Amino acid sequence: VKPNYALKFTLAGHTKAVSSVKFSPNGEWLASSSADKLIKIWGAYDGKFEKTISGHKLGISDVAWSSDSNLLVSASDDKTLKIWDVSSGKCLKTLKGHSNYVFCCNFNPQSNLIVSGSFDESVRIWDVKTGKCLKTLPAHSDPVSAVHFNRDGSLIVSSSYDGLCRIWDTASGQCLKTLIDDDNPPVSFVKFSPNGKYILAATLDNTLKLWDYSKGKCLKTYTGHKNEKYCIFANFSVTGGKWIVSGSEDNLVYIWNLQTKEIVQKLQGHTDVVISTACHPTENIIASAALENDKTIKLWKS
Amino acid sequence: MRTEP
């Protein structure tokens, strides 16, 4: 019925607000990115600091792992993405082509492609091996908040402050679907469900929503949190109970029962907006990170 | 920019 997530570790060291935390697919590591221009690597279980990864010239808003937990891509205000080899710390490629801050990024499930969204209102698809831009999508009319690939990589989901979520054919770059509901709030986050049937989408009106994007229908609504200013990640938690996990601008982490949409827990301790959360791929471990007045990461376990 | 309102 309900989770029992308790604070285990508080990770410190980013010198400015944290923007993103992500667990590696193999469950060994946690990567964080930050407005301090740095990427940091922590042990997923003991929170033990591993290394710092640097090279971006301005703050980073997102970081993402390749399927094999070997590479990272980061999206920065310096208008680049960078492909990092985690074990050697090398910047392998610097993807240039966006005309404004790069906000979000993800590998496809094969880690041969990267998708990015930017304040320049485009979605771009990059080749991992050459670091070149394969397509630019004129996706939105306002800044793009989130970009995600589906289970086979055949589709890409986009989110923007223009109020739309869009689905794209990865091979053609064609828009296959535009989702919006009865109000048009800025869409601040989007991602596919692990089975690839649904998109979970956040809007700046304090609302998360589960969509069946084929049927074009909102299935579930998750409310209770505070989310009007910032692009807060949300997650499907599947290692124990089937939850929805999201930060909040009231400094708490919210956990919903996915089916019944009830708040089943709130996690307390950050001293600022909880901007990013992440769910461990095989343990009941939640990572959370907060903004300028906190600068810490926290590992909770149930 | 994610850390900014």
From Swiss-Prot, chain A:
Spans of repeat WD: 13-52, 55-96, 98-138, 139-178, 182-223, 226-266, 269-302
Residue(s) at site: Important for interaction with histone H3: D77, F103, F233, E292
One GO cellular component, as annotated: NSL complex
Disulfide bonds: none
UniProt-listed SMART domains: WD40
Effect on the protein upon substituting T178M: Found in a patient with childhood apraxia of speech; uncertain significance
Crosslinked positions (Glycyl lysine isopeptide (Lys-Gly) (interchain with G-Cter in SUMO2)): K16
UniProt-listed GO biological process terms: gluconeogenesis; negative regulation of transcription by RNA polymerase II; positive regulation of DNA-templated transcription; positive regulation of gluconeogenesis; regulation of cell cycle; regulation of cell division; regulation of DNA-templated transcription; regulation of embryonic development
Functional note: Contributes to histone modification. May position the N-terminus of histone H3 for efficient trimethylation at 'Lys-4'. As part of the MLL1/MLL complex it is involved in methylation and dimethylation at 'Lys-4' of histone H3. H3 'Lys-4' methylation represents a specific tag for epigenetic transcriptional activation. As part of the NSL complex it may be involved in acetylation of nucleosomal histone H4 on several lysine residues. May regulate osteoblasts differentiation.
Gene that this sequence comes from: WDR5
Family designation: Belongs to the WD repeat WDR5/wds family.
Keywords tagged on the record: Acetylation, Chromatin regulator, Host-virus interaction, Isopeptide bond, Nucleus, Repeat, Transcription, Transcription regulation, Ubl conjugation, WD repeat
Protein name (record): WD repeat-containing protein 5
Result of changing F233A: Strongly reduced affinity for histone H3. Significant decrease in interaction with KMT2A
CDD domains: WD40 (cd00200)
Coiled coil: none
Effect of N195A: Loss of interaction with RBBP5 and reduced ability to stimulate KMT2A methyltransferase activity in association with RBBP5 and ASH2L
Modified residues (N6-acetyllysine): K82
Subunit structure as annotated in this protein's UniProt entry: Interacts with PAXBP1; the interaction is direct and links a WDR5-containing histone methyltransferase complex to PAX7 and PAX3. Interacts with HCFC1. Component of the ATAC complex, a complex with histone acetyltransferase activity on histones H3 and H4. Component of the SET1 complex, at least composed of the catalytic subunit (SETD1A or SETD1B), WDR5, WDR82, RBBP5, ASH2L/ASH2, CXXC1/CFP1, HCFC1 and DPY30. Core component of several methyltransferase-containing complexes including MLL1/MLL, MLL2/3 (also named ASCOM complex) and MLL4/WBP7.
Chief localization: nucleus
Gene Ontology molecular-function annotations: histone binding; histone H3K4 methyltransferase activity; histone H3K4me1 reader activity; histone H3Q5ser reader activity
Outcome reported for the amino acid change (mutating D77A): Strongly reduced affinity for histone H3. Significant decrease in interaction with KMT2A
Compartment list: Nucleus
Organism of origin: Homo sapiens (Human)
Leader sequence residues: none
